[PDB]
Amino acid sequence: VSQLFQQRIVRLGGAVDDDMANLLVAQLLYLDSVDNKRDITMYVNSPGGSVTAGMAVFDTMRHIRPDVSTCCIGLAASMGAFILASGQAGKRYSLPNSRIMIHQPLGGAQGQATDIEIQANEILHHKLTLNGYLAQFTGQSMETITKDTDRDFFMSPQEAIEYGLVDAIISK
Amino acid sequence: PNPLVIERFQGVVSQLFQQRIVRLGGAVDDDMANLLVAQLLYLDSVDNKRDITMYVNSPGGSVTAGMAVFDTMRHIRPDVSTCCIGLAASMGAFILASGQAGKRYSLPNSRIMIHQPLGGAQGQATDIEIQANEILHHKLTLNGYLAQFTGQSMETITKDTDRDFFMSPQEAIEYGLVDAIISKPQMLQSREV
Amino acid sequence: PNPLVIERFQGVVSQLFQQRIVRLGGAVDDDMANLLVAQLLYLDSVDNKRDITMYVNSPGGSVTAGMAVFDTMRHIRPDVSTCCIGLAASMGAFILASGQAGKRYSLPNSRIMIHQPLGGAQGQATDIEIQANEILHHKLTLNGYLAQFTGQSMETITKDTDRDFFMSPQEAIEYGLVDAIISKPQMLQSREV
Amino acid sequence: EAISVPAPFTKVAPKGDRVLVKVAEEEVKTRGGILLPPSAIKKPTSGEVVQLGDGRVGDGEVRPFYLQPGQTVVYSKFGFMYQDLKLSNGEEYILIREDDVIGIMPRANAQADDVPELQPLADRVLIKVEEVADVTMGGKERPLSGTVVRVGPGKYDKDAEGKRRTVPLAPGDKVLYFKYAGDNMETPSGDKFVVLRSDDVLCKA
Amino acid sequence: SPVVTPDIQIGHGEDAIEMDLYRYLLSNRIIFIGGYINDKMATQIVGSLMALEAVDENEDIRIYINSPGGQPYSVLGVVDAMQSIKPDVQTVALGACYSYASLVVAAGTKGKRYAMKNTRLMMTQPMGGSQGDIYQIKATVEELNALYQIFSRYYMKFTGMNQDQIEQATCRDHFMTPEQAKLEGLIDEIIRGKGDYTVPPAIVRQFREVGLVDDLTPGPFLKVDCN
Amino acid sequence: ATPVPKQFKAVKPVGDRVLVKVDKEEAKSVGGVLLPASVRNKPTAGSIIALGDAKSVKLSDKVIYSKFAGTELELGGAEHVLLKEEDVIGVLSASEKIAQLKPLSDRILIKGAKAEDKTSGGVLLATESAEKPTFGTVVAVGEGREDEETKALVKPNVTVGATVMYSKYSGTEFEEDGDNYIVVRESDILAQLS
Amino acid sequence: ATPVPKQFKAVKPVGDRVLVKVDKEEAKSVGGVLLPASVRNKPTAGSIIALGDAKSVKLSDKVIYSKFAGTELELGGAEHVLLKEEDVIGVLSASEKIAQLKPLSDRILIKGAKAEDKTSGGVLLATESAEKPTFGTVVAVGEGREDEETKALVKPNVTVGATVMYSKYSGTEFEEDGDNYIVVRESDILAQLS
Amino acid sequence: AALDITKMTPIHDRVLIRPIEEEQKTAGGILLPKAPPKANSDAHIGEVLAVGSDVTLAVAKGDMVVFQKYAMAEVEVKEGQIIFVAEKSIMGKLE
Amino acid sequence: PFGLLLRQRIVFLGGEVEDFGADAIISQLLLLDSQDPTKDIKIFINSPGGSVTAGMGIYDAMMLCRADVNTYCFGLAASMGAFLLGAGKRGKRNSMPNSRIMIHQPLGGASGQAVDIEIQAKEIMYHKANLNRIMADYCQQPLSKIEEDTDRDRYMSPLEAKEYGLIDHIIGGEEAVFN
Amino acid sequence: PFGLLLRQRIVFLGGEVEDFGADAIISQLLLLDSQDPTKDIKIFINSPGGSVTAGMGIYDAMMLCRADVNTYCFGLAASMGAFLLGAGKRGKRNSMPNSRIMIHQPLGGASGQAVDIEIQAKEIMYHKANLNRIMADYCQQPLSKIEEDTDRDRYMSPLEAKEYGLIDHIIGGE
Amino acid sequence: PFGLLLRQRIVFLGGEVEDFGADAIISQLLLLDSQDPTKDIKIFINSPGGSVTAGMGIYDAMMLCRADVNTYCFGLAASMGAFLLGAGKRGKRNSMPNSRIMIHQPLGGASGQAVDIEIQAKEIMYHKANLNRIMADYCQQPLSKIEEDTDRDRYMSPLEAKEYGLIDHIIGGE
């Protein structure tokens, strides 16, 4: 898997947690430092993950002074699809038979009754942060993003272009 | 545990080994004590006159493993300068106190704990009193060497290290554990008038 | 344990290949026997006349895993000198007895243990008597091979092999397991007058 | 690689015993739009000599280089063992080695037409590719046959004579070559060419 | 080895260090089969068979087999790939063979099937398990009959026996000695030591079945009348 | 290092071997915090006692040298280094300023024209550049190499006021009140831009 | 080491190569305890069958060599080494004492001026693997390397009775009844401490 | 050189050899079927040209010399091995 | 080893298909297409199953490859490898003469909310509907006949796989296939 | 990965702060000051918390070096990296616009006698009074409001963290 | 690590000596015999105990060495290292002045059939008669004084271990 590092390809595989997010931004610090003109293509394949782990890789891609390219491989369930929509307009690619799922992220509330209400406000703040940023990436209204994110909704790659998740597909 | 951090941890301890810096790894047991005595018996090849920096950080451990490190620190020709960063246990602070007199340095934010060493006993009736006597022998030798390092009396050590006794290096410099503290001089702040 | 002991053990085994010494250690398993078959055919390729000093120290193992170790020593061109260090087992002393006559050595404080092979049977009623014939095939061939190595009769072997029987190196010369004892000459100790 | 010069000086001095050339012809910014496969951009670049440096110091004796400023040095652009030192007025001074000297081309300021007329300068030999099969007795590889067109002088001899011992090959001989043994060249007429070093010259055929 | 197995290798040179034991033996056209034959190591033996195929098309690829069994479809993929290559394959039987490793040593070329003196061979019908509804029970018995019909005509091509002798042998658990497997046609040559001609107890029972040895005259054989 | 026996009381080097005395054991230059592990940016340059068969090294020179130049020895309680003439940087003048350190071997001293901070206060996705291109300017030149034809030391065509696109991590680095001073190879000048 | 069919037996080494036979495996001096293959400290102490173009040594000389001297060959029904002229030390006399060796090439045999009791009965000692400092007294010296300029051999500037410093792990070590003896390069001498 | 034309005489700076293969492949069913990679191939020289750029080879045609383990190319021409040996990789003759 | 077949453009698909094992085959498939878009790529499929999410990425990777692909079935092909068997180029599909072919729908578990169950119930039906219409293209079979043969959990011999349209050629001259 | 940026003084506090994990951070911190004491050392923060005595070991080791210290927070910092976020000097404490800042008091542990409970009680009472003196230094906040902020769990946005004194700048501006 | 001291003829008897742990030390004891049968071999003992059948393979491999044997104890020698401490050459067995030396009968276990208890009791009595003969050899003590001391756990200081015969010279002074 070391041959992809010289071709400026990073791999987003499995559920995103703290040690994977530290390794993923470490590869992003090196690929922009060797060249600030060529893009970085990322193969996203994730079934979900933590709330703060997906937000730790979202902001560092916006700091890359050249654009990036995101290609869906197989499936992105409620955490990888947010990484797809945060890419550059005109560089969001996907497989023709892939799958895009948009859902609110998982997360628990362990502690006191005063503690579980003050930490659920952060989850309600995470829902306004995720749906607030996703509405600016797809160009749709604020109501339609908060309407379908409560339950799991799978999206075909053909209907993902008209909705605004991806920009094009690689058929060849 | 993550196997990726092991080669990164092995690299930074080997680069400090060229600068004569050793490390106490976790609890003191038999596997690291043979590795630690291999490190103190190798740093004399470059020079035997300059001091040896010892990073001290141990949350506990056995009794006989720390005694194998204690006797070699006071026997070798260069002075061993111990440095406690973080948390030192009863065996960890004894390693810190076993350094050269006047060259035991630390930082004033650490925690120093000294007590009688932990142990157990299992067997027959005469097996209990045999294994209890060597713990009291280890009680007398740990409290006896601490009375010579700190300069206190014999009754002072046994009545303070009877239970868990946590100290700061601001007050350990008055007892005799740490000789001096290492801290940069800060700029004076404009306080309120 | 820690792989640093494994790395320093891998080095001294690699130096043993330059002195034509193979290593039989631990329990005789299926994977370890395949590591020892491939290391015996390579030592014949660099020289087909020099002997191979086989190190034998095993506390047990499988019966069919050691059967591949046995017949690969008799068909190769040079003789294999087998030595007993520490402990021999039922699959360990069978390696000891399979050496060349006149070149089987041992140490005077090692233990030679021999018994019938273990195992078990489970399944249907026809599966019991078939699997019992497999162990009796392993019972009669090991008793048949040991009668040719030591020179004893057939009935005196199975009277000692049916139970766990330990052997001394002083009585192994009279019985026929090892041929000689390699040891340094003793010191000229004065008597008590 | 692409270092900018300071402003108050423009005259770049060489890297001691190296070759300083300049080339801006037949680049990406050119008038030709329809071209050959990318050996056409790997053509003789015809680098004009600006200034030649001193001899080779080495271990205590000055070695000559056998070059003149009135020529056009050919070098490989894909073989990035050089520096691209660009001036402020669009001029790019390229500092190449003596091993990067391919040869001389008559009528150099043109397209890839005088490739059969390439005369080597350093330890290189021009081999014409014969239209034969590549591997027929293999299954390990087999070299392809080739004909010598032009020969060049070799390296400097360290003896007391101080002469450049030339390559013993002759034009018209049949030799062998491998596909990864040297720099491949292509002509629009269909003929192919390759240049090998003297250490890769093995035998005739 | 109960706790750990060290890397038993040798690489020595005057200038550079060589590879380990299994990498050096694979370069000498020798393949080792050890452990359980699952789907993971099945691609290792087939992939090494295709690796040595591109190196040379005439040298004899040797495969060493020592396994107590394996997956029935993973052991099926190594036989038909071994029969669909150009050069001949010399098989050597190591340790024991339990109903799947005895097939690959019988699948070698004629005249190159070498078995040792104390090798254990076994041939049985394939096993399996019932699962759920009757639409899958009928699919299970049709699968076990398909695995039995494929493995039946494998032994007919490599040994040349009759189908009645295979059904009488693979009905129950039948372990074969190489002296008995040489009569059945599974192997081609017996490997012995320096004049090692010991008689195994399977042939002493075979000598008792034909009437060559009795209880009064046991001969120079092992005792067998202790039943 | 080892203590020498009082048996000879004589040192006579052969070949390209020059004996140098160590100045002091760090000379307490880091006093006030007393710094048991600190920076050693000077390889103990000192005076010369014996010459041996050296060519360009004089007896009254204050020879600076690399840390791996030779074997350390405790001549009568004082540390001594028997350096080689091949890896000498230069000699030190009467003043302790490093700008007056004139080289006597195949070395060229430069000043340096690099940026003091490549991060500009600290920015993410940074801190990597190519190791070869950099900027620096020459202040002084040292001695050249011996020629076989003329039997004399000749110097290359380099001046004392040119800027040089040199190569990083060659030689060593020093500092004089904030001003850097780097020694490079001779054989490290890409262009004499003056 | 490969077996050779014996065809003609007309060995003529090209260049300065020397074909030399190993005499014995030390006549089994340590035979009786397990018979181990041990480290050889006397590589190829035998006679030369074919000289070639070498002129520093004769045919019937008993010369010691280095461990990595040449490639081993199994010719003549025995082991043989084919080595060059750059690694010869000197001839053995009728007595096999290693102290009586005269160097026949650019080699210097030294003993080692150290104390006869360093362990002091088994004290807790370590870190004795020093690299820079060591001592050695000279017993004999030979003729130096051939100079390519004047086409002549010159003796190095070293006496036969002085203590000279040298470098660790350079050369081959020998033992003569507890006394160490190392042969070094010519060109491995630093300073005579006498 | 020995495939397209019949004039297999090489240049003055190299010679051609023919290594001899032994019958170690028969015992491969028990043992390792060949030797480990080593020098001293014990090959006879087919074409001998003494004078070259490096030191010469005072040898006759048909004799056998020793070779280094590197700095040579390998090829198979008419079922026999041919190694492109240099003139500097020769140390001496064998018996 | 495996690296010797990689430079000869031959990859292996062995073991159970996982998400970590999916992108390892996709990353090496695009490297062979960028090196030589004219040379064919031979694959070897031996899989006892896998996920329907990661298995479709192998099918899209072979459709993304501009060069032709060659397939080889040895060992097992259970519900994921049989779909990747026929998905190659027609006329260049070979296998072993005794390998087994299993055409069956993928599996899946469902748990959670009541609205959560009906989402993944029609999702695995849409995966069943998409896998049926894709496998009916290269087989030249009607849709109503190929949608009921995948419901039967019975393996397929390679003798009847040839006229079924899933495979083209059999290595061995088509006489070594045993019933 | 991590070794490709370790030569430019890049410290990643990934994972939970344990006895072995924090020791790898301390042992690499002494390496960077010994090679060059004039250039800055960058420390990245992405950790959901950790031990009390182990997480304190990163703060006093960063104060041991004589060079400059830059600290950046990625994702979530829960009472161990958030205390280590403001541990650097003023002016070079930057943070991401979407990173969560969690303020929480540390935990404790005791198992033995009841007199061993009160030893660990005053041991964590000393650690609570220690960090309130430290956190009020680089934030310019009084001790009355900084004790109640550590009482309850509060996830803080970096918009209000700039005026609180814990961070200094925001990377990107918005 | 330990490879730097393996070339300096130093071995380490560290950790609990199991069947694989004893195999690593006795394989190193014959390599140092093959390297030089003249120079000294030092054995460093730090072990909490082990089995008798694995620790007996270290004694005869040490007695097979024709060179001088130096045995130094560092820390704990519990029932196995104390036997190997006296097993060296007289005049070279030393120990640190604050180490613990425990002498004890060799441990053993018995299970299986009742007829195995016939065999397992005999090998214990054979190992007891073998070790008491060796321990009375280098200590110059009668057999009645050895058996009454090893019957239970007996820790001892190196002061009374000098007059017993386990060590010969004190290396730490007093």
CSV table of C-alpha atoms in Angstrom, one decimal, chain I:
chain,number,residue,atom,x,y,z
I,1,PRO,CA,6.1,-14.9,-5.4
I,2,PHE,CA,3.2,-12.4,-5.6
I,3,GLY,CA,5.5,-9.7,-6.8
I,4,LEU,CA,6.7,-11.8,-9.7
I,5,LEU,CA,3.2,-12.1,-11.0
I,6,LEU,CA,2.6,-8.4,-10.5
I,7,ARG,CA,5.2,-7.3,-13.0
I,8,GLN,CA,3.7,-9.8,-15.5
I,9,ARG,CA,0.3,-8.1,-14.9
I,10,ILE,CA,-1.4,-11.0,-13.1
I,11,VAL,CA,-3.2,-10.4,-9.8
I,12,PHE,CA,-4.9,-12.8,-7.3
I,13,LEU,CA,-8.3,-12.5,-5.6
I,14,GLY,CA,-8.0,-15.1,-2.8
I,15,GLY,CA,-9.9,-15.5,0.5
I,16,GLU,CA,-12.9,-13.8,1.8
I,17,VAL,CA,-13.8,-10.5,0.2
I,18,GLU,CA,-13.5,-7.7,2.8
I,19,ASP,CA,-13.4,-3.9,2.7
I,20,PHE,CA,-9.6,-3.9,3.4
I,21,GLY,CA,-9.1,-6.5,0.7
I,22,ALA,CA,-11.2,-4.7,-1.9
I,23,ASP,CA,-9.2,-1.5,-2.5
I,24,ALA,CA,-5.9,-3.5,-2.6
I,25,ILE,CA,-7.1,-5.1,-5.9
I,26,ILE,CA,-8.5,-1.8,-7.2
I,27,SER,CA,-5.3,0.2,-6.5
I,28,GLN,CA,-3.2,-2.3,-8.5
I,29,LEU,CA,-5.7,-2.6,-11.3
I,30,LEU,CA,-5.4,1.1,-12.2
I,31,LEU,CA,-1.6,0.9,-12.1
I,32,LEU,CA,-1.6,-1.7,-14.8
I,33,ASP,CA,-3.9,0.3,-17.0
I,34,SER,CA,-1.7,3.4,-16.7
I,35,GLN,CA,1.4,1.5,-17.6
I,36,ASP,CA,0.1,-0.4,-20.6
I,37,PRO,CA,-3.5,0.2,-21.9
I,38,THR,CA,-3.0,-2.5,-24.6
I,39,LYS,CA,-1.8,-5.5,-22.6
I,40,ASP,CA,-4.4,-7.8,-21.1
I,41,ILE,CA,-4.7,-8.3,-17.3
I,42,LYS,CA,-5.2,-11.9,-16.1
I,43,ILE,CA,-7.0,-12.3,-12.7
I,44,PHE,CA,-7.5,-15.4,-10.5
I,45,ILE,CA,-10.7,-15.6,-8.4
I,46,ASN,CA,-10.9,-17.9,-5.4
I,47,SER,CA,-13.5,-16.5,-2.9
I,48,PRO,CA,-16.1,-18.3,-0.7
I,49,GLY,CA,-18.2,-15.1,-0.4
I,50,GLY,CA,-18.1,-11.5,0.5
I,51,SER,CA,-20.0,-8.3,1.0
I,52,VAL,CA,-22.1,-6.8,-1.8
I,53,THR,CA,-20.8,-3.3,-1.1
I,54,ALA,CA,-17.1,-4.1,-1.6
I,55,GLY,CA,-17.7,-6.7,-4.3
I,56,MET,CA,-19.2,-4.1,-6.7
I,57,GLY,CA,-16.1,-2.0,-6.5
I,58,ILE,CA,-14.1,-4.8,-8.1
I,59,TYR,CA,-16.7,-4.9,-10.9
I,60,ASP,CA,-16.5,-1.2,-11.4
I,61,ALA,CA,-12.7,-1.4,-11.4
I,62,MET,CA,-12.7,-3.8,-14.3
I,63,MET,CA,-15.1,-1.7,-16.2
I,64,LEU,CA,-12.9,1.3,-15.5
I,65,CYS,CA,-9.9,-0.6,-17.0
I,66,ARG,CA,-9.5,0.4,-20.7
I,67,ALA,CA,-7.5,-2.7,-21.5
I,68,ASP,CA,-9.1,-6.1,-21.9
I,69,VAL,CA,-9.3,-8.4,-18.8
I,70,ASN,CA,-9.0,-12.2,-18.5
I,71,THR,CA,-10.5,-14.2,-15.7
I,72,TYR,CA,-9.6,-17.6,-14.2
I,73,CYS,CA,-11.7,-19.5,-11.7
I,74,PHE,CA,-9.9,-22.0,-9.4
I,75,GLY,CA,-11.0,-23.4,-6.1
I,76,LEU,CA,-14.3,-21.7,-5.1
I,77,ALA,CA,-16.6,-19.0,-6.5
I,78,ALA,CA,-19.5,-18.5,-4.1
I,79,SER,CA,-22.0,-15.7,-4.7
I,80,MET,CA,-19.4,-13.0,-5.4
I,81,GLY,CA,-16.7,-14.7,-7.6
I,82,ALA,CA,-19.3,-16.1,-10.0
I,83,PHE,CA,-20.5,-12.5,-10.6
I,84,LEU,CA,-16.9,-11.4,-11.2
I,85,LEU,CA,-16.3,-14.5,-13.5
I,86,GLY,CA,-18.7,-13.5,-16.3
I,87,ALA,CA,-18.1,-9.8,-15.9
I,88,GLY,CA,-14.9,-9.9,-18.0
I,89,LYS,CA,-14.6,-9.7,-21.8
I,90,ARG,CA,-16.5,-12.2,-23.9
I,91,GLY,CA,-14.3,-14.8,-25.5
I,92,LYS,CA,-11.5,-14.5,-22.9
I,93,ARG,CA,-13.1,-16.3,-20.0
I,94,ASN,CA,-11.3,-19.5,-18.9
I,95,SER,CA,-11.4,-21.6,-15.7
I,96,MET,CA,-10.4,-24.9,-14.3
I,97,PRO,CA,-12.3,-27.9,-15.7
I,98,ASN,CA,-13.5,-29.0,-12.2
I,99,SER,CA,-14.1,-25.7,-10.4
I,100,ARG,CA,-17.4,-25.0,-8.8
I,101,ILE,CA,-19.7,-22.0,-9.7
I,102,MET,CA,-22.3,-20.8,-7.2
I,103,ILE,CA,-25.0,-18.3,-8.3
I,104,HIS,CA,-26.9,-17.1,-5.3
I,105,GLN,CA,-28.1,-13.8,-3.8
I,106,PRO,CA,-26.0,-12.1,-1.1
I,107,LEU,CA,-26.9,-12.2,2.6
I,108,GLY,CA,-27.5,-9.5,5.2
I,109,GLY,CA,-28.8,-8.7,8.7
I,110,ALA,CA,-31.3,-6.1,9.7
I,111,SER,CA,-32.0,-4.6,13.1
I,112,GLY,CA,-33.1,-1.3,14.7
I,113,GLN,CA,-36.0,1.1,14.3
I,114,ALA,CA,-39.2,0.3,12.4
I,115,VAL,CA,-38.4,2.9,9.7
I,116,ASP,CA,-34.8,1.6,9.7
I,117,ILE,CA,-35.9,-1.9,8.8
I,118,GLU,CA,-37.9,-1.0,5.7
I,119,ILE,CA,-35.0,1.1,4.3
I,120,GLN,CA,-32.5,-1.8,4.3
I,121,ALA,CA,-35.2,-4.2,3.2
I,122,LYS,CA,-35.7,-2.5,-0.1
I,123,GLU,CA,-32.0,-1.7,-0.2
I,124,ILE,CA,-31.0,-5.4,-0.4
I,125,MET,CA,-33.9,-5.9,-2.9
I,126,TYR,CA,-32.4,-3.1,-5.0
I,127,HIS,CA,-29.1,-4.9,-4.7
I,128,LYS,CA,-30.9,-8.0,-5.8
I,129,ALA,CA,-32.5,-6.2,-8.7
I,130,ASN,CA,-29.2,-4.6,-9.8
I,131,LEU,CA,-27.2,-7.8,-9.6
I,132,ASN,CA,-29.8,-9.6,-11.8
I,133,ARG,CA,-30.0,-7.0,-14.6
I,134,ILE,CA,-26.2,-6.7,-14.8
I,135,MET,CA,-25.4,-10.4,-14.9
I,136,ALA,CA,-28.1,-10.8,-17.6
I,137,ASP,CA,-26.2,-8.7,-20.1
I,138,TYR,CA,-23.1,-10.8,-20.8
I,139,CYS,CA,-24.9,-14.1,-20.4
I,140,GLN,CA,-27.4,-13.5,-23.3
I,141,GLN,CA,-30.2,-14.9,-21.1
I,142,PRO,CA,-33.7,-13.5,-20.4
I,143,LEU,CA,-34.4,-11.7,-17.2
I,144,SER,CA,-37.2,-14.0,-15.9
I,145,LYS,CA,-35.0,-17.1,-16.3
I,146,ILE,CA,-31.9,-15.7,-14.6
I,147,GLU,CA,-33.8,-14.3,-11.7
I,148,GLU,CA,-35.1,-17.7,-10.5
I,149,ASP,CA,-31.8,-19.6,-11.1
I,150,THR,CA,-30.1,-17.4,-8.5
I,151,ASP,CA,-32.7,-18.3,-5.9
I,152,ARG,CA,-31.7,-22.0,-6.0
I,153,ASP,CA,-28.8,-22.6,-3.7
I,154,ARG,CA,-27.2,-25.3,-5.8
I,155,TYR,CA,-23.7,-25.2,-7.3
I,156,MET,CA,-23.0,-25.4,-11.0
I,157,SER,CA,-20.6,-27.7,-12.9
I,158,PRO,CA,-18.5,-26.0,-15.7
I,159,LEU,CA,-20.1,-28.4,-18.3
I,160,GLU,CA,-23.5,-26.7,-18.2
I,161,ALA,CA,-21.9,-23.3,-17.5
I,162,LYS,CA,-20.8,-23.0,-21.1
I,163,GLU,CA,-24.3,-23.1,-22.8
I,164,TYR,CA,-25.6,-21.0,-19.9
I,165,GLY,CA,-23.6,-18.1,-21.2
I,166,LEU,CA,-21.6,-17.3,-18.0
I,167,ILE,CA,-18.3,-18.7,-19.4
I,168,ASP,CA,-16.8,-19.1,-22.9
I,169,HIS,CA,-13.9,-21.5,-22.8
I,170,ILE,CA,-12.7,-24.3,-20.5
I,171,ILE,CA,-9.0,-25.1,-20.1
I,172,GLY,CA,-8.5,-28.8,-20.9
I,173,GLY,CA,-10.2,-29.2,-24.2
I,174,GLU,CA,-13.7,-29.8,-22.6
I,175,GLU,CA,-13.2,-33.5,-22.0
I,176,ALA,CA,-11.8,-33.5,-18.4
I,177,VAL,CA,-15.0,-32.0,-16.9
I,178,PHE,CA,-16.5,-34.6,-14.5
I,179,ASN,CA,-20.2,-34.6,-13.7
